[PDB]
């Protein structure tokens, strides 16, 4: 497999996105601690900046959401 | 799903820049067949990247994936 990044969704105040990891590096995640900008794109994530890991998700542990605010405003 | 449309990282080279978006297969059907699309026509499926994005390729085996590439600067 490999990495998928989906498009952007953004609200009043975050341009949002989530990545989609293959199950092989999703057992790799975290499932204590949100991810810090240098753990992330040791992972394979290759994003621009100001994305941030914003939230854990216990279920679907594949499914990496991730934030940043509207374009640099 | 809040979303279905997935685009993987742009593996490139020294001549080309690839890419290329997935989208489900609920759609493949409004997917030219018979020719490339222009940026108009893959706008349409929904596909949003950087304007310079060019379909270059149909990926027969499984055509519900969208192959684009473009160039990469420096000569010339």
């Known amino acids: ?36 900008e240098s753990e992330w794109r040791n992972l394979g994530v290759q994003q621009s900046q100001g994305w941030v890991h914003y939230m854990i998700h216990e279920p679907e542990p594949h499914i990496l959401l991730f934030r940043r605010p509207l374009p640099k405003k």
């Open 1 to 36: 497999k490999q990495i998928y990044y989906s498009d952007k969704y953004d609200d009043e105040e975050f341009e949002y996105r989530h990545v989609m990891l293959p199950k092989d590096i999703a057992k790799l995640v975290p499932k204590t601690h949100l991810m810090s």
